[PDB]
Subunit: 74 residues, 10 copies
């Protein structure tokens, strides 16, 4: 039983690694938003909702990691 | 039978690591969409379907990881 | 057999790591398709099949990872 | 109990790996802010709040890692 | 015997990690093909075979990983 | 007690890995500062404080890793 | 002996990780060949032998990994 | 104590991984310095101290990794 | 003794991972050579020796990994 | 005393992983040197000392890794 609980806790720690992908990806999206608005200010209203969508989709990958992490923890 | 269960939980945590690829890749597609539209607003209708296709394909790699994750958990 | 079964399950999880390569790669190809068409709209019908081919070959690397994963889980 | 507690501490350490994602992402956002402002100084007031949003969302992914680390530690 | 078998299966899973290199690399090549053709459509016939060569050579590194994987799983 | 202590020390080492993020990120910020100033020297006073902010925020992620490291080593 | 043989097989697997470096590097070289030829077709005969040298040297790093893998396997 | 000492030595090795961050980061900063001066020779005396500062802050992340490494080895 | 020999073999496998850095770095150098000659053909004789030096320095990092790997193996 | 020795050898192999950073970073410096010189041949004498400095500093990070490596081995 020591073994099973110990595996849940190590597994939960490992499950957070994938969050680095959303950390990096969210940033890549906002970088593009910023570069895009700087080069073409008039395009802001068009690309801002695209950036919000990109963020949410990238972020969803982190949510799934965290879901597995919490499932293992609790 | 404790050792096998422990392995399933460790394996499940490890199985989420690959989701970082979708996290980054989704972002890469949206970055291109945003920069492409900022440089050429008129191309938006053409490249948006391409972005949907590209992110859906990149995302699916992470769903495959999660499939293995949930197999090992349940 | 408890130890061997355990090893199959950990190995199965480890075998999914390589899928991050196709995750990034597929995105890289579609990013180029998008930036290529934005800079040159008239090239679309030429570069679109190239992106499909590129996607498929990158995807195949993930297919090989998942195959090993499923062989360890079931085979 | 020793084995479970050992697993908690190993897992706590592993749970900080994903913070490298926010480390890189935060910088990616600020690099774009700097480059965008250098190319187009007049756009600063527009992009600065986007950079703040971008960095906060990237950072939060690493804070979710840290949160799991602390749950395991304490 | 249990320990050796378990090691083979763990190793087999580990062996697929390097496949991420080909996954990313194949895509890098096709990205260049697409951007190169978009910038200069007339160069297509020259650069397409360079992309096939590049993809094949990148792919081979993944094949080497998969080979070791299969040697462990079966051999 | 031997097992818990060993786990603390292994964990402490693992906890420093994330520091690579700040190592790369701090540099990414200063690279942008340098390229931004080279392209537009007059923007220096505007972008320098953005680089300090960016570096500090990136650095903090590494500080969080080191904090966990020290909690394991001592606390 | 079982433990030593186990270690050989685990080590053989680990020894292939470094091949991802040649996988990416080989592609980096060919991407530059393609982009350089697209921008300046007349330079092809000059850069092609540089790309062959570049790819062979990158690949060899992965072959040294594979060599260690086989030494452990056999 | 054999297990704890073993853990100190493995932890010490693990604690050097994060140095790859400073390895890449330091290079990123100097790369920008070089590309910045090539594009604008007259900016050299302005961007050179910025590169030194950038190097130092990136380097510090590696210093923290090595400190933990040496604490595990000796402290 | 099983333990020590087993540690030598796993350690030798792990020691090859760092070779990925030279795999990637050698490629980055040759990419720059290629892009540089394509943009400015007359600069070839100046930058080719720089590329050879860059290659050798990056390559030396892989040599050191392999040295540790062979020390562990033999 | 077998377990401690085993750990030293494992630790030594792990200690070379960080050398990949120098491998990539050395290359990054030389890439910049090559591209900088191709775009502006006249700047060569100015940027070459900067490249020497940058690669020497990046390389040293890998030497620090190797220091730990050789401590654990000898
Ligand atoms: C696919 C799901 C994602 C949804 C995205 C929706 C985007 C639409 C868009 C309009 C947003 O709502 C937004 C930009 O307005 C927005 O994010 C706001 C809600 C948000 O308040 C924003 C303005 C901020 O200021 C934000 C930086 C907050 O100050 C900061 C405290 C929150 C950071 C953060 O990561 O929160 C997350 C995030 C919203 C994520 C986003 C989740 O949600 C939270 C709560 C739910 C779980 C716990 C997730 C886990 C995470 C790892 O995915 O974290 C939630 C806790
Ligand atoms: C390695 C060869 C690849 C083949 C590529 C072929 C390219 C040609 C091109 C014209 C395609 O057919 C395509 C662009 O039309 C295409 O991908 C469609 C079939 C696809 O429906 C696409 C348009 C989508 O809408 C797609 C995002 C779906 O909505 C989504 C549910 C599927 C995602 C996905 O990754 O599916 C995979 C993929 C096609 C992969 C692609 C495999 O195939 C599936 C089925 C077979 C096995 C199970 C693989 C495993 C995977 C890990 O490689 O997954 C298959 C399950
Ligand atoms: C260095 C060896 C590589 C050779 C490359 C040769 C390139 C030349 C070029 C002319 C090709 O043949 C090609 C572009 O025409 C080509 O790939 C075709 C064969 C292929 O049908 C292509 C046009 C596709 O349509 C392709 C996207 C398929 O639809 C898709 C199902 C296959 C993906 C794939 O990765 O296949 C691999 C690949 C060819 C790999 C590539 C092998 O081969 C397969 C079959 C042989 C073995 C089993 C390999 C092992 C793999 C892990 O390396 O997998 C084989 C399973
Ligand atoms: C979010 C917190 C970070 C705060 C950043 C604040 C930035 C504002 C800005 C004005 C700075 O203060 C600065 C640019 O002036 C600055 O860094 C100076 C303090 C500093 O002296 C700078 C000018 C240097 O010359 C610097 C390159 C030093 O020569 C060098 C020995 C220090 C490197 C270093 O990383 O120090 C860290 C750093 C400041 C970090 C950064 C901490 O702080 C130190 C001391 C406090 C604790 C121990 C942290 C822990 C670390 C792991 O995060 O390490 C501290 C040990
Ligand atoms: C985190 C704060 C950093 C301080 C940066 C200060 C920057 C100011 C700037 C003007 C410097 O002093 C410098 C550019 O002149 C400089 O680095 C020189 C001192 C240095 O001699 C440089 C010109 C070299 O020639 C250098 C490549 C040497 O030939 C080489 C033997 C040393 C490499 C090296 O990484 O040394 C480190 C470094 C300076 C680092 C730098 C530490 O310091 C040393 C001594 C202290 C400890 C042991 C650190 C550990 C390391 C892991 O951070 O290693 C120190 C051992
Ligand atoms: C810091 C040491 C490095 C020295 C670089 C010297 C560069 C100068 C430059 C003029 C070279 O000599 C060169 C470009 O002419 C050159 O590399 C030639 C010798 C080489 O024959 C080249 C023309 C090739 O065609 C080359 C692609 C070969 O065909 C190919 C079979 C060899 C690949 C390879 O990686 O070999 C290595 C490499 C030279 C490396 C390079 C080592 O050396 C070998 C033999 C020694 C050990 C075993 C190393 C291990 C490696 C992991 O560092 O591998 C050696 C086995």
């Amino acid at each position: 039983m020591q073994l099973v609980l110990a595996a849940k806790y190590i597994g939960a720690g490992i499950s957070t690694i994938g969050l680095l992908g959303a950390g990096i990806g969210i940033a890549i999206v906002f970088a593009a938003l910023i570069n895009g608005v700087s080069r073409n200010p008039s395009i802001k209203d068009t690309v801002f909702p695209m950036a919000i969508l990109g963020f949410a989709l990238s972020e969803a990958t982190g949510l799934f990691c965290l879901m597995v992490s919490f499932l293992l923890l609790f």
